[PDB]
Amino acid sequence: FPELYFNVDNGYLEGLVRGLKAGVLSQADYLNLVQCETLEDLKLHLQSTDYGNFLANEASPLTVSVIDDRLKEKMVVEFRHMRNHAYEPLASFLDFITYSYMIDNVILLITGTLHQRSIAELVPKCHPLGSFEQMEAVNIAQTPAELYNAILVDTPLAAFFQDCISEQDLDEMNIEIIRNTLYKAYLESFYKFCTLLGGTTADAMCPILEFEADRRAFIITINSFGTELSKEDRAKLFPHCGRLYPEGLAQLARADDYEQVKNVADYYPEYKLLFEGAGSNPGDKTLEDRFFEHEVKLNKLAFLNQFHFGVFYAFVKLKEQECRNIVWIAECIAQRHRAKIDNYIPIF
Amino acid sequence: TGLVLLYSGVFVAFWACLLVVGICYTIFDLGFRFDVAWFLTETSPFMWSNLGIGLAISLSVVGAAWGIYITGSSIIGGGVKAPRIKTKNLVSIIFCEAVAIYGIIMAIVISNMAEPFSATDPKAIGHRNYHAGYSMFGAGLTVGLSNLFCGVCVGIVGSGAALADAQNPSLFVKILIVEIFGSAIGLFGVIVAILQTSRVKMGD
Amino acid sequence: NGPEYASFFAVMGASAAMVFSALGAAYGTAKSGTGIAAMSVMRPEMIMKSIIPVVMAGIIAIYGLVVAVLIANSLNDGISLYRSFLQLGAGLSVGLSGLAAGFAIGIVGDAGVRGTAQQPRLFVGMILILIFAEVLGLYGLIVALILSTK
Amino acid sequence: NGPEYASFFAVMGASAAMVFSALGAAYGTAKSGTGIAAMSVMRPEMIMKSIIPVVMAGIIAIYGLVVAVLIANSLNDGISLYRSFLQLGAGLSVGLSGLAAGFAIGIVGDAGVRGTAQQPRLFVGMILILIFAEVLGLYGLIVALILSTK
Amino acid sequence: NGPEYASFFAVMGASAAMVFSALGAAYGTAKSGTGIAAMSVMRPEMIMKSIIPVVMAGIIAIYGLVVAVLIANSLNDGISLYRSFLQLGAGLSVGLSGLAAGFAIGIVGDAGVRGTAQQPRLFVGMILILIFAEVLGLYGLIVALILSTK
Amino acid sequence: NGPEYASFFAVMGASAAMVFSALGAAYGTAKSGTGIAAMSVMRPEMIMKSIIPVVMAGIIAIYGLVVAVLIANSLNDGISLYRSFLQLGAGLSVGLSGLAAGFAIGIVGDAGVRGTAQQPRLFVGMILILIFAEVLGLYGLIVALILSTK
Amino acid sequence: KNGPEYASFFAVMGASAAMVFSALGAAYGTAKSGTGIAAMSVMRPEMIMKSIIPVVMAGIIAIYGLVVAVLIANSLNDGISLYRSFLQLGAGLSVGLSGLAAGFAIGIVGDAGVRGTAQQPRLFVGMILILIFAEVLGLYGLIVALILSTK
Amino acid sequence: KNGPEYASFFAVMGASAAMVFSALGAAYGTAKSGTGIAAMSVMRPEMIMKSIIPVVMAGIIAIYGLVVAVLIANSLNDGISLYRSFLQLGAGLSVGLSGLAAGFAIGIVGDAGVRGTAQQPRLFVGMILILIFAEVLGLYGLIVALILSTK
Amino acid sequence: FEYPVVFNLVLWIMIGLALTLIVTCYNIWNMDPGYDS
Amino acid sequence: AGFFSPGIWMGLLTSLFMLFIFTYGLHMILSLKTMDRFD
Numbered sequence A: 001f002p003e004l005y006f007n008v009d010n011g012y013l014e015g016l017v018r019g020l021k022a023g024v025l026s027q028a029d030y031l032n033l034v035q036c037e038t039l040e041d042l043k044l045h046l047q048s049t050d051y052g053n054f055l056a057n058e059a060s061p062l063t064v065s066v067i068d069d070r071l072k073e074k075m076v077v078e079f080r081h082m083r084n085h086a087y088e089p090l091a092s093f094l095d096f097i098t099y100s101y102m103i104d105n106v107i108l109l110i111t112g113t114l115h116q117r118s119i120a121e122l123v124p125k126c127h128p129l130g131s132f133e134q135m136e137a138v139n140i141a142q143t144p145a146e147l148y149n150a151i152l153v154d155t156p157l158a159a160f161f162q163d164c165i166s167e168q169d170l171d172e173m174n175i176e177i178i179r180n181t182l183y184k185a186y187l188e189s190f191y192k193f194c195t196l197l198g199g200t201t202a203d204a205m206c207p208i209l210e211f212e213a214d215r216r217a218f219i220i221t222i223n224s225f226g227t228e229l230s231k232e233d234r235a236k237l238f239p240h241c242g243r244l245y246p247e248g249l250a251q252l253a254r255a256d257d258y259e260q261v262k263n264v265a266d267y268y269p270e271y272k273l274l275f276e277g278a279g280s281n282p283g284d285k286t287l288e289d290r291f292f293e294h295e296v297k298l299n300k301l302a303f304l305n306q307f308h309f310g311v312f313y314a315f316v317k318l319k320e321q322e323c324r325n326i327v328w329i330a331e332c333i334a335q336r337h338r339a340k341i342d343n344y345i346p347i348f
Numbered sequence B: 001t002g003l004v005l006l007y008s009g010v011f012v013a014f015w016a017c018l019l020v021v022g023i024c025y026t027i028f029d030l031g032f033r034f035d036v037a038w039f040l041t042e043t044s045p046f047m048w049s050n051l052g053i054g055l056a057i058s059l060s061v062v063g064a065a066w067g068i069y070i071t072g073s074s075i076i077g078g079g080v081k082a083p084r085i086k087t088k089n090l091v092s093i094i095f096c097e098a099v100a101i102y103g104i105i106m107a108i109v110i111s112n113m114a115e116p117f118s119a120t121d122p123k124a125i126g127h128r129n130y131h132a133g134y135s136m137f138g139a140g141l142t143v144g145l146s147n148l149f150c151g152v153c154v155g156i157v158g159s160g161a162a163l164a165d166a167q168n169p170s171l172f173v174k175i176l177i178v179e180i181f182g183s184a185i186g187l188f189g190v191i192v193a194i195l196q197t198s199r200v201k202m203g204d
Numbered sequence C, D, E, F: 001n002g003p004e005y006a007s008f009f010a011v012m013g014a015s016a017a018m019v020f021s022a023l024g025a026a027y028g029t030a031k032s033g034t035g036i037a038a039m040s041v042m043r044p045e046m047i048m049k050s051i052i053p054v055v056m057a058g059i060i061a062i063y064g065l066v067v068a069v070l071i072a073n074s075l076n077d078g079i080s081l082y083r084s085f086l087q088l089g090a091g092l093s094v095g096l097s098g099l100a101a102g103f104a105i106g107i108v109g110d111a112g113v114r115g116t117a118q119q120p121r122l123f124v125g126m127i128l129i130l131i132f133a134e135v136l137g138l139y140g141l142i143v144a145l146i147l148s149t150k
Numbered sequence G, H: 001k002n003g004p005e006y007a008s009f010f011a012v013m014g015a016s017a018a019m020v021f022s023a024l025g026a027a028y029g030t031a032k033s034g035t036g037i038a039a040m041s042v043m044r045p046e047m048i049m050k051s052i053i054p055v056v057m058a059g060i061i062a063i064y065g066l067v068v069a070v071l072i073a074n075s076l077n078d079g080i081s082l083y084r085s086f087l088q089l090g091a092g093l094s095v096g097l098s099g100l101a102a103g104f105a106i107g108i109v110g111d112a113g114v115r116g117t118a119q120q121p122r123l124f125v126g127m128i129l130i131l132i133f134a135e136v137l138g139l140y141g142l143i144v145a146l147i148l149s150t151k
Numbered sequence I: 001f002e003y004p005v006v007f008n009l010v011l012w013i014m015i016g017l018a019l020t021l022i023v024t025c026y027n028i029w030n031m032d033p034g035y036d037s
Numbered sequence J: 001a002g003f004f005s006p007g008i009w010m011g012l013l014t015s016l017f018m019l020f021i022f023t024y025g026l027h028m029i030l031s032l033k034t035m036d037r038f039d
């Protein structure tokens, strides 16, 4: 019933984004990258993939800050191509992927405002996916975050700012409480939008958005032990989206200890066996290196369905792992510290 | 849903009005005014005969073209990165093109059996010209709808097989078996359609 | 014999026994065949062992052809109105129950061959649920053979 | 005796007892069959004991099979219009309530084997809710056996 | 005696009492059955105590059964049109009010059982609201009894 | 006396007085009863204080029961067409006006008990709104008693 | 010989439906696959005139319905038999609903084709070979309407 | 010879439906492609008067229906035969619903065409070539309405 | 004698002018002008 | 007289059939929405 339609508007773009799956590096592509000894030789072993001739114009001294910036500018021009050819049931979905980067850029645009800076932080120091090159009133808003917050409501992040009054970001709230309260309102609005689009895109995507609400339920309550934010301050940072919602979030707001978040993940047998990072050992994978193996395990499962929108969000989050894996191979090669070079995630 | 509210607003108001009318023909004894006999016999058998030829070919090429654009967006969409698809994956197009061959064959086999008569009385028009009228309607419906369902069935499998050929080129000859079982549904509608109009002769 | 309009209901019993059981066989092949072609890129070895949800949807197609040949050969010029209502009710009973047995093969056969590509322990459990969804079309056949052969 | 179109309502009770109970047994098999393939990727031991929500959906189909054989074997040409209305309501009673019972087995059998994967203590509780959703097909059977055998 | 179409309105009271109370009893068992599987994963002690909102939904199943047997045992060949209309409005009044009582049980039984996982004092208050949604099916029972027995 | 079909419109006033006031009382106890569960997590004290929207939604159900007993006791074999038109409009006047009043109780009773979770000053104001949504069923009662007892 | 007075309703309803339902299919294949021209025009402006084939092949769909609807409007006659007028209703549904659906597939493949040709130019002979198979479908409805209307 | 009393209903419907549905297509071509002129105006204001071509193409769709609403209303008599008024019912539908389709195709191509001309001036020779194909869909409905109204 | 003519002339107009009226008043009721400023 | 004559039932089963063909062919053209941006 969503299969006999959906090739009307989104049939060419789905076959395109599955053609970009075939360019995601396999295990045998990674095993030829870990044999490289210099970043000059990593330029050679990357040319046998579909990345080829992307570092051919930079410099003869090839540093790791150029490879990282040239890898992620290739994911932008692949995402901007699939957005400029998108139709309105899919273009509303592709704009919801960029709100995770518009949130990370709005917060970067108010730290310069509280410290009296300008557009000099905008162009070089923001992610190109969530980018402000339109809404040009943001680009000249030198006002101290009061006549500027009245311009951020002329931006697609306006519907998320209904829990942040312009007096709260005016030195009243910490800069990470403004992040995660927007990201709480972002995931809960993206979970409802992915439920209105029913059928195949609501059962291949809501398992991904349930785990994203349980990563930030576990990682927030673990990093909130030594710091000064109360239990009522992190209970409003939990997104009400995941599997943990009525019961786990009641216990996670009362934890105060790492052993009290381990026995609330024991109730859920998918989250236990993920809590066996166990960083008391010197060399092994930590907790977030085991949460990244589960983020990309659910993202590979979105390509097992066909007629759905979840094939596009599971490509951006697997081309982001390419910009994290190849840089990690390049950062263990340039430093010649390649005993932990196998601590990447072998996606395909 | 904006426009589906209109299609469900008419479908509810049609059957709620047939619920009220249906419990008012029986309830004050006017059953005799319904007369499904008078509907089937005073409507011309040339109307049922030409809704059989009109739906044998047109509802086949609805499903023949519904199956082409489902998998033809996966040839050109999947063949941008891997352009070796466009010559091997054309037999998915042919398997939903052949379901319109069964339409145009079974539309000119049925059309050879319709011949004019001159009678107007439902006793003068016997139950051979009425059986020939109903069997041409029911044979263009079982070859038009069974090819409308077969043509989209070999388009959805053909669109999935064109996106598996993009990753591994060795997989297409094994998912071709699924399009064989799907294209046998259209041939099963032709077998029933030649048996509904086997002993049919129209005219006087 | 019967009235002049009597052969309208036996014709719609041979049409609806094949049309409604083609829609079940087309859904059972297209919904599960979507799952075959997508699991095959990650597991190209079980691509032939997982065809059997599409050959079980094809039995639903030949469940409707057995009765649509049986009706369209026993139908003559001027049958009784009792015998044409029997073959109408024998046409809807295998068609619309083959449409249900073709839906429950499509939804099970799609989810079964995804859970088999992730874990091969499901294959004996997948072809056991697929018998329960395929005898729904057999129950409609053995009551369309009772109704038509009266 | 009765009219000739009296057998129309008597074969719409043999049809609707089989098509509405197969459309209920399809929803109990398909919707709860995705729940098996979603829980067996983590718990492959509880596969053969999770066939109970699709076994109990298969008894809903054979409830409608029994009534559609009782109606079709009590058919004659020229039956009365009173006995024809009894078998129409005997098809709608075991049909449309078996469809209601198949709607409920499909919902609590899908969601039951999701909670049984997260906790092995729900297996006795899920079975008790499956009993309450399978006597709805049994209540429709004992009204179909009362109405058709008058 | 009554006309030949008169028995159609009495069988459609025996059928509409059964299939509309079963649709209410299915919605009370399905929606408040998924509330059990979402509650038990943190508090598995109150599983058997949470069978009450699917027990109270199961009494609506037999509110329609006891008049579907009561109407089908007062059926006669040639009942009057006034006697036949009383049993139509006795089936439509315990069905569509039992469908309402099952609609309200499945909403407050699902939200209530999810509410007692984090607050155990709600269970004596949830069971009190379920009484109020139960008697909506009982008010339709005592008005279907004074209509059939006339 | 009157015609033979005359008792149809009085039975559809006895049943519409019940099934539309039971749908209003269903929406009254289910929409407000899902607000008691959200109030209970932070304020478990005022659980018994919050059954008042559920109690006053059950008053709407007994408004429709009184008229439905009053109509079903005013039935005879062969009433006039004028008398049975009076009781059709007496069933809609308490059914479809109890469906409005029960819809209004379920909406303000839901927001009222979620507003008294955060401020108990609304509790004396929540009950005062619900009397205004109570008398809409009472106004429908006293026009149903006027129409039926003529 | 003279039929009923309403007999010529069904032939004009076939001459209308042969032109109306073909113009709806020709307007879908022009509007959908003309939207795809403007998306590939911004980056690859040299392939504009080469990619007007999916609005040319959707224009032959409309002249399939014009040929039938002229033959029905010329075979119309006062007092046609009821047999001859239903022959041209079935001739209007045979080329009407054919050109409606064949003009849909030229729109979807033509919009997906001119966007995948502007990036991979090897797909141009593969796009036109699918559009051919979606254009003979409009000709299967034509040559079965020429049989029915001239029967 | 004389027609019945209700016979003039179907010919005054084809007079209205030739004007109703061709003005409903000409209004969709003016609205959907007039939304695109205001989008290209904010950056490229020299191409305003040159981009009125997609709304003068939809203006010819409106006068296709005006001509045959005059050709039908001047062929009306009291007591026209039922055949002579059924001809002017399908002569009204085959030009109203053809101009309705040809107005949906003008307004969609005229929207994407004048927004792509703002970013690529080489598309203007291509957009005006597609609008010829989307305007003759109303012309094919005109020459089948004239061949039906006259007889 | 022309009762089936006048019945179908009134019925298929007054639900052709009601569906045209309902669809029109549905689109003006749900207009969405855009209003924050 | 009756509500329907046999000439109306043939003309109504034809008009209300190709009204279903028209609103299938108009629902598809009411949903061929264009793009917002260009590159």
Ligand SMILES: CO/C1=C/C(C)=C\[C@@H](C)[C@@H](O)[C@H](C)C/C(C)=C/C=C/[C@H](OC)[C@@H]([C@@H](C)[C@@H](O)[C@H](C)[C@@]2(O)C[C@@H](O)[C@H](C)[C@@H](C(C)C)O2)OC1=O
Pocket: H049, H050, H051, H052, H053, H056, H059, H060, H063
């Ligand atoms: C006042 O005339 C108008 C007349 C109207 C209402 C109706 C009919 C004439 C028309 O319905 C007929 C059918 C078509 C036709 C032939 C129209 C001429 C229109 C005018 O003329 C183009 C333009 C006029 C704006 C146009 O003329 C521009 C001034 C322009 O000159 C700018 C050119 O750069 C542009 C390319 C060129 C093209 C569009 C013809 O015309 O408007 C008008 O209101």
Ligand SMILES: CO/C1=C\C(C)=C/[C@@H](C)[C@@H](O)[C@H](C)C/C(C)=C/C=C/[C@H](OC)[C@@H]([C@@H](C)[C@@H](O)[C@H](C)[C@@]2(O)C[C@@H](O)[C@H](C)[C@@H](C(C)C)O2)OC1=O
Pocket: D128, D131, D132, D135, E048, E049, E051, E052, E055, E058, E059, E062
């Ligand atoms: C097995 O046949 C049961 C029901 C069946 C088959 C059929 C119908 C006839 C039913 O339609 C009717 C209504 C009978 C019915 C509903 C009886 C109450 C029965 C038992 O009585 C709880 C519980 C049973 C689940 C019981 O074992 C529960 C565990 C429990 O007892 C645990 C208690 O802690 C909890 C408080 C208690 C409540 C309601 C008193 O439910 O059902 C059954 O046995």
Ligand SMILES: CO/C1=C\C(C)=C/[C@@H](C)[C@@H](O)[C@H](C)C/C(C)=C\C=C\[C@H](OC)[C@@H]([C@@H](C)[C@@H](O)[C@H](C)[C@@]2(O)C[C@@H](O)[C@H](C)[C@@H](C(C)C)O2)OC1=O
Pocket: G049, G050, G052, G053, G056, G059, G060, H129, H132, H133, H136
């Ligand atoms: C001007 O309007 C044209 C025709 C019009 C107005 C009217 C009807 C008869 C027409 O409505 C119908 C649709 C005629 C029809 C069914 C095809 C006619 C096609 C022309 O004959 C290719 C092309 C085509 C020649 C031309 O438009 C392009 C220049 C081009 O030729 C350039 C080539 O490089 C490109 C390869 C080529 C395709 C056709 C092979 O298109 O246009 C036209 O003249």
Ligand SMILES: CO/C1=C\C(C)=C\[C@@H](C)[C@@H](O)[C@H](C)C/C(C)=C/C=C/[C@H](OC)[C@@H]([C@@H](C)[C@@H](O)[C@H](C)[C@@]2(O)C[C@@H](O)[C@H](C)[C@@H](C(C)C)O2)OC1=O
Pocket: C128, C131, C132, C135, D048, D049, D051, D052, D055, D056, D058, D059, D062
């Ligand atoms: C595959 O079709 C099989 C039989 C068919 C077609 C039965 C129909 C006529 C059915 O229409 C109806 C329901 C009757 C019914 C009742 C069948 C039970 C069947 C089998 O059950 C013995 C299953 C099979 C599920 C069962 O045998 C499992 C192996 C198992 O034994 C595993 C046990 O661990 C599990 C607890 C036990 C319970 C669930 C019954 O089932 O096999 C079969 O051959």
Ligand SMILES: CO/C1=C\C(C)=C\[C@@H](C)[C@@H](O)[C@H](C)C/C(C)=C/C=C\[C@H](OC)[C@@H]([C@@H](C)[C@@H](O)[C@H](C)[C@@]2(O)C[C@@H](O)[C@H](C)[C@@H](C(C)C)O2)OC1=O
Pocket: E128, E131, E132, E135, F048, F049, F050, F051, F052, F055, F058, F059, F062
């Ligand atoms: C037997 O079923 C109960 C009532 C039923 C079914 C009534 C039907 C016959 C119905 O037709 C109506 C509603 C009769 C009616 C109108 C009862 C009103 C209150 C009941 O009382 C009498 C409450 C009430 C005792 C109790 O349930 C509450 C705990 C409370 O006592 C505690 C107080 O804090 C609370 C504020 C007060 C309010 C809500 C009245 O009631 O209970 C019941 O058991």
Ligand SMILES: CCCCCCCC/C=C\CCCCCCCC(=O)O
Pocket: H024, I012, I013, I016, I017, I020, I023, I024, I027
């Ligand atoms: C006897 C005549 C009755 C039939 C006439 C039907 C003609 C319908 C005409 C116009 C209806 C279209 C109104 C809807 C406007 C669409 C709004 C939009 O799409 O933006």
